Amino acid sequence: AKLNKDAENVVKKAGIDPNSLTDDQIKALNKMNFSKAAKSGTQMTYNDFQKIADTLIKQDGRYTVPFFKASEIKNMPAATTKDAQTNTIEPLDVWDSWPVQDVRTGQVANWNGYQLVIAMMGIPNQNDNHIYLLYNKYGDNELSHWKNVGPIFGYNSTAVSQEWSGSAVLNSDNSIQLFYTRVDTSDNNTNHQKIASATLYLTDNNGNVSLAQVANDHIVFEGDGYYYQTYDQWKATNKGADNIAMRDAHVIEDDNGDRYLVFEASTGLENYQGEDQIYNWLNYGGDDAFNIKSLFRILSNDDIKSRATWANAAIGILKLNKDEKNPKVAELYSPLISAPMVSDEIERPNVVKLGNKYYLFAATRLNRGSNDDAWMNANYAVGDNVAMVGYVADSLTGSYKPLNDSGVVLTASVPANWRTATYSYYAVPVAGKDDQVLVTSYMTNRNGVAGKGMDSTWAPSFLLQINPDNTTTVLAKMTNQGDWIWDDSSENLDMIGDLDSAALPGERDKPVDWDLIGYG
Numbered sequence: 001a002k003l004n005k006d007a008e009n010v011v012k013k014a015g016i017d018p019n020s021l022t023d024d025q026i027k028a029l030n031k032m033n034f035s036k037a038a039k040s041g042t043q044m045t046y047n048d049f050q051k052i053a054d055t056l057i058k059q060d061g062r063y064t065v066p067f068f069k070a071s072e073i074k075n076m077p078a079a080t081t082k083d084a085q086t087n088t089i090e091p092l093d094v095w096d097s098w099p100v101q102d103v104r105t106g107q108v109a110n111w112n113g114y115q116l117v118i119a120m121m122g123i124p125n126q127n128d129n130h131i132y133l134l135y136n137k138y139g140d141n142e143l144s145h146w147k148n149v150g151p152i153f154g155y156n157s158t159a160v161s162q163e164w165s166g167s168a169v170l171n172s173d174n175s176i177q178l179f180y181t182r183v184d185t186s187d188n189n190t191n192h193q194k195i196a197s198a199t200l201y202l203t204d205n206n207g208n209v210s211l212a213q214v215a216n217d218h219i220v221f222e223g224d225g226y227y228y229q230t231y232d233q234w235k236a237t238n239k240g241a242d243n244i245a246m247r248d249a250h251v252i253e254d255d256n257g258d259r260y261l262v263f264e265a266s267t268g269l270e271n272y273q274g275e276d277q278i279y280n281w282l283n284y285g286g287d288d289a290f291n292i293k294s295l296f297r298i299l300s301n302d303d304i305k306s307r308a309t310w311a312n313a314a315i316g317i318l319k320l321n322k323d324e325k326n327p328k329v330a331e332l333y334s335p336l337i338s339a340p341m342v343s344d345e346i347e348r349p350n351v352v353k354l355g356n357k358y359y360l361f362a363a364t365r366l367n368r369g370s371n372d373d374a375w376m377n378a379n380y381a382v383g384d385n386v387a388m389v390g391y392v393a394d395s396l397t398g399s400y401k402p403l404n405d406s407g408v409v410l411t412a413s414v415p416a417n418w419r420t421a422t423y424s425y426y427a428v429p430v431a432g433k434d435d436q437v438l439v440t441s442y443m444t445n446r447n448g449v450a451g452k453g454m455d456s457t458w459a460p461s462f463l464l465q466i467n468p469d470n471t472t473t474v475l476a477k478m479t480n481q482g483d484w485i486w487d488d489s490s491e492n493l494d495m496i497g498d499l500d501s502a503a504l505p506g507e508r509d510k511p512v513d514w515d516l517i518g519y520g
């Protein structure tokens, strides 16, 4: 019935009369740990997440993904191809994709006059998660000119061993070092994820690129238990509320010759998920009134309490050894970003060097966050809850600080079941500029949610201005679908839509897809 002095201090700083509190509220407040020491890097706080959501709800043009003219959007021809699992030619969903990049600068690599992209594809509504190599003439702006070489790990594949996202760069001899996620589903169909690497040797014969050989395929890392959550840790306590993530490895080398992977994971025992996290003041990150209001809200609702108990998404970093073609872990670090209490999924981490700063971007679905009100309000306002977040550091393993106050960079602008819905935003540098990136993404959500034969395809790309004061601004500068290389000739202002033209006829009267957007 009686507050400790720390708790009475914050209550009073908050303008709350201590007498107004219940016995349960006092008990909650007396458990609060007020230590301000950071454990797993810079945190996305409960306050940050709330602000990201508020920004999405405001639909402010500085951050909204631009409207795309829905009438211009088409399936990717190269996504009609021989399927890795059925061995039959099918119209596939294509989603997460990444270009072969220069390991230092991030620029889309020119390989013998070609640009190369690696992409997740599969038959809508099947478990069919494999990666395919794609190519086009360097600088070419036509979606339909892209060509599918085929599944990197071959035909006769199955759902028992899958490939999820990662990254790709050129080695010294112009072979390709692929980083990807090896997913083994033999332990009761669980998505046992592992960061893996292999070397791709290609050949160039009369306008066609072929995959000659996949060499050195091996597991690089799958978690240590202290910095990053292991499969065994997740399996031990999972009753269905805990996410598992060890994926989306992004390779980057700095000017000291050190090569690193920046990847998606969860924290380990360094700062682990648990109900205790609801009682760490550091996680809240607002003023006293906000923090107290937030604590009571979390404890008032079983689903928010549960999400908070299980949330501990991390963007990890490790240093590799020197061996380009057979990378192994040389050193592990604490997470660059973590979201204990706040979110259990932050995806596709990406580092772009611009000038002498390192910009760390990532995609996230706010409905993987603990604050149900915030993301259910996002859904109600826009029909979706996706975002790109961003941070910036002066060195690769340095302290990352959020952009635009809260870390918000892009916010959803259309309902998740529309043709022009986007996700898996991936920023790529622009030749000759240190203050813009080109944002790529996949368009149309998977598995036919936008209707008959509306496959996931490549979005038109758009420019994002990076300002020197750790802010960003979306530009009204757009390409054709599937353009990875911005230049003067790449602009197609005809692809720009507005509120009205972002929908195909009928889409406005279409029912909500609730499994897609979530509901607390």
Ligand SMILES: OC[C@H]1O[C@](O)(CO)[C@@H](O)[C@@H]1O
Pocket (backbone or CB within 6 Å): 095, 096, 120, 129, 164, 165, 166, 181, 247, 248, 264, 347, 348, 423, 424
């Ligand atoms: O399909 C799995 C892939 O999709 C993502 O969740 C984003 O769409 C990535 O984190 C992962 O590599």
Ligand SMILES: [Ca+2]
Pocket (backbone or CB within 6 Å): 242, 243, 266, 273, 310, 311, 312, 313, 344
């Ligand atoms: Ca978790």
Ligand SMILES: [Ca+2]
Pocket (backbone or CB within 6 Å): 139, 140, 141, 479, 483, 484, 485, 486, 487, 490
């Ligand atoms: Ca282009």
